From a paper:
The bacterial relBE locus encodes a toxin-antitoxin complex in which the toxin, RelE, is capable of cleaving mRNA in the ribosomal A site cotranslationally. The antitoxin, RelB, both binds and inhibits RelE, and regulates transcription through operator binding and conditional cooperativity controlled by RelE. Binding of RelB inhibits RelE by displacement of the C-terminal, flexible α-helix, which contains a tyrosine residue (Tyr87) that is critical for catalysis (Li et al., 2009). RelB is additionally known to dimerize through formation of a ribbon-helix-helix (RHH) DNA binding motif that allows transcriptional autoregulation through binding to the relO operator region (Li et al., 2008; Overgaard et al., 2009).
In this work, we describe the crystal structure of the intact E. coli RelB2E2 TA complex determined to 2.8 Å resolution, corresponding to the fully RelE-saturated complex. The final structure comprises three RelBE heterodimers in the crystallographic asymmetric unit (ASU). Two of these heterodimers associate into a heterotetramer by noncrystallographic symmetry, and one engages in a similar interaction through a crystallographic 2-fold axis. The structure covers most of RelE (residues 2–80 of 95) and one molecule of RelB (residues 2–79 of 79), whereas the other two RelB molecules lack either the C terminus (residues 2–69) or N terminus (residues 33–79) due to poor electron density. The flexible, C-terminal helix of RelE (helix α3, residues 85–95) is disordered in all molecules in this crystal form. In the RelBE complex structure, each RelE tightly binds the C-terminal region of its associated RelB (residues 50–79) through displacement of helix α3 (Li et al., 2009). Two neighboring RelB molecules dimerize at their N termini to form a RHH-type DNA binding motif that closely resembles the structure of the isolated dimerization domain determined by nuclear magnetic resonance (NMR) (Li et al., 2008). In the resulting heterotetrameric complex, the extended conformation of helix α3 of RelB results in an overall very open, V-shaped complex with an RelE-RelB2-RelE architecture and approximate dimensions of 105 × 60 Å (top). At the position of Tyr87, which is required for the endonuclease activity of RelE, RelB has a valine (Val59∗), thus providing the hydrophobicity while removing the functional group. To understand the proposed model in structural terms, we used the structure of DNA-bound Arc to analyze the consequences of binding of the complete RelB2E2 tetramer to DNA. Structural alignment of two complete RelB2E2 tetramers with their RelB dimerization domains in adjacent major grooves immediately suggests why the complex cannot bind at high RelE concentrations: Due to the close proximity of the binding sites on DNA, binding of two adjacent tetramers generates an overlapping, W-shaped complex in which the two RelE molecules at each end of the complex (denoted as RelE and RelE′ in Figure S2A) clash.
Author numbering:
A (entry chain A), F (entry chain A): 2 to 69
B (entry chain B), E (entry chain B): 2 to 79
C (entry chain C), D (entry chain C): 33 to 79
G (entry chain F), J (entry chain F): 2 to 80
H (entry chain D), K (entry chain D): 3 to 17, 23 to 53, 56 to 80
I (entry chain E), L (entry chain E): 2 to 83
Write the structure that this text describes.
Amino acid sequence: GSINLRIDDELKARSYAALEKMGVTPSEALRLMLEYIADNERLPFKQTLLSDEDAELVEIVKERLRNP
Amino acid sequence: GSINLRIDDELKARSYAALEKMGVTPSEALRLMLEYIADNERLPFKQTLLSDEDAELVEIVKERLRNPKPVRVTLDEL
Amino acid sequence: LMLEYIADNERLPFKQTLLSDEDAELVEIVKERLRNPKPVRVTLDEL
Amino acid sequence: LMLEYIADNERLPFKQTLLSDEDAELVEIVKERLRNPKPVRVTLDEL
Amino acid sequence: GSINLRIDDELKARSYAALEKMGVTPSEALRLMLEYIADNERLPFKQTLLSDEDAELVEIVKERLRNPKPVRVTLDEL
Amino acid sequence: GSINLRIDDELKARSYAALEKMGVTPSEALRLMLEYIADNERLPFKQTLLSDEDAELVEIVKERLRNP
Amino acid sequence: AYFLDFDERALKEWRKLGSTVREQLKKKLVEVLESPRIEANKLRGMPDCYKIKLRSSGYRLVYQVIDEKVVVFVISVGK
Amino acid sequence: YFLDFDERALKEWRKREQLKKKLVEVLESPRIEANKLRGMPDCYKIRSSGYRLVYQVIDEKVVVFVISVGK
Amino acid sequence: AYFLDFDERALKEWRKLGSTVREQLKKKLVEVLESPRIEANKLRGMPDCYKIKLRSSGYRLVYQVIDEKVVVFVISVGKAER
Amino acid sequence: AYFLDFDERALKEWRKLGSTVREQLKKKLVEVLESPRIEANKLRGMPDCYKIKLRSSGYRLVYQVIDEKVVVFVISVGK
Amino acid sequence: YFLDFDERALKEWRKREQLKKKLVEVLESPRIEANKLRGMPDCYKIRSSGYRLVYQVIDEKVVVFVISVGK
Amino acid sequence: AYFLDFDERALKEWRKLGSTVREQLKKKLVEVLESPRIEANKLRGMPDCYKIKLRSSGYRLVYQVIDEKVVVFVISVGKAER
């Protein structure tokens, strides 16, 4: 198969530059993310949005454990 | 710009399925990763290969700190 | 057996979560006051 | 009371330090093998 | 070079006592600290004043992440 | 009282430079260390020499907990 | 759909499993190969290592998940 | 296990069938490590609705203590 | 670079900075926007939060980096405490 | 020989201690002022904070040790 | 508490009066948090000589398990 | 700068590096000697140990910083594993 990606010119530059430094090809990089996403049903990035939602739930528990 | 990615047929199927469930387009996903890599200079995955390389480095440090044999030196000696 | 534990340790084998959220109260008053500290140097005579 | 714990949790209230230094054995064989890894890709057919 | 330090009489007493117990000369102790400060750009003591400054920064972050109100902006807006 | 310290010229430079950045005077810095040492009977630096002696004691315990 | 790597030692151990026991481990490996991170089987003390545990027999498989290569790396098989 | 409710949590509950269905499973063997609210002592969470109940398990009194119910 | 989000409170605080102080905070912000994780400025006690510190003035900016959206989320701007 | 700072609130609390109770807290404060870090009284959850605990009465003092200013900072007094 | 010795530790012991004096205090209330050998589960250390004994306290069997004696 | 100690094993390893590779390790060592704690190169799992990494060649130097003696203690030099 094949995928065609619309990409900003400057981002093509900086991301490819970085990939050469890492010694990973752009195709390998993108096929990893797609395989990951396919198997884990999520993005590989830190779930900090969900993370600091839990942190606020804890802040409410804390306040309530002060005077039960 | 534009990128052409050669992709296995089944992986296109499975990843597209997954992306739709998430409501993320294949382009948005890939543009996040490329932007991340560009700014952070690493893949967004857990750096576990690097992690267990250090683990063995730690193992050599541990073994050697059992009977340390320090030698004070200058750069000119090196 | 459990008695032999409580004999020596002078506590229960379970985790003292009651003291956990009693030391959390203190931390709170401390965390709160560290926000607005008002330090004052004192002779022990001045106590 | 302690019985009511062991009833539900299906373990002892004390900390299972025996499983601690049983999982340490495994970690060892794993830490050791991660030193000299010898990876081999396998069809599940090839199993 | 040379440094002259003005020191309280009792502190000279007590610190010298302590230094002898350790078998460290007053000069060696002070030359360690000056070298540390020069290279690390901080005092060798626990940075607890900075620690509980961050603790309050964390407290403001926590309070604000309860009801976050993000606004996407560009630098030119700033 | 007074203390006279013999100091390498280059170190006087770099350490004073750094102290100005930190907004701490050289006299304050040295009086802190002396007071600390006087009260704690140790240097304010990390006790990493003692720290990695304990780490090796642990390494021996670990090996022995393998086959008791 | 992660790739599967076996350490050679892990593969040698595997070869001398009873036909019965490897059949049931294999049934759980394929579940693992799709979504490899099971929070309950986390081998505490090592990066990204997990167990596969058998009710009967008491045999144990240990694998590490390497997301950056999308592989599940089988390190140990035995008891 | 015993079941305790904080006064605030009970006010939330009043304003439920499916959660209660999960609570009785919680009441026998209360520690489900997968729902561990990490960052807090002995606290845990309980598909649809996206509503969240939070309880603490106290080994020394065999109670499940429901502290919060909502979103 | 990462996208830039400001919390409403943070933007209000930003507005009433001296032209000079926001000028230097801004200049370090554009650097942050292309490499937001400076582990040295890591704000311990909250997920993925970091500081921007000004030597003079003593002002502090706090942002959280949200990788999943490639945004830097500026939460607080000011100088807490005396 | 650390310096002693009291938070104003801590000092106000102190003012309304029984003459008896502050006398015994004070006896432990002066022990603290020389070698302030007692590993057993570490208030877990906050940087460098320690307790002074009284057998009788059950009153508690909380202080933080700031090595960089060689001060013991008394934050809380009460029960 | 019960007292167990590992075989290696006992070989060390043979090659003692002051340590034994501290062991009986250890045998009743074994957890002295100040001598915690940090970095290890439930392990602790026991002025002169600079010799070190290391033992582990196992709550589930009420034993003090002396693993190492020496320098 | 901090003093420099090499373990005997580490010095033996150093000796049999190509003139080029020890040349570039040395150049990063003099930088380390004046600011030995690069938290980014922090070797987690041991007290105060840090890495020096070479992009090419892939060689690794590991040192521990002992502040109480202001020394950098180079423990290992090589490339472990494949």
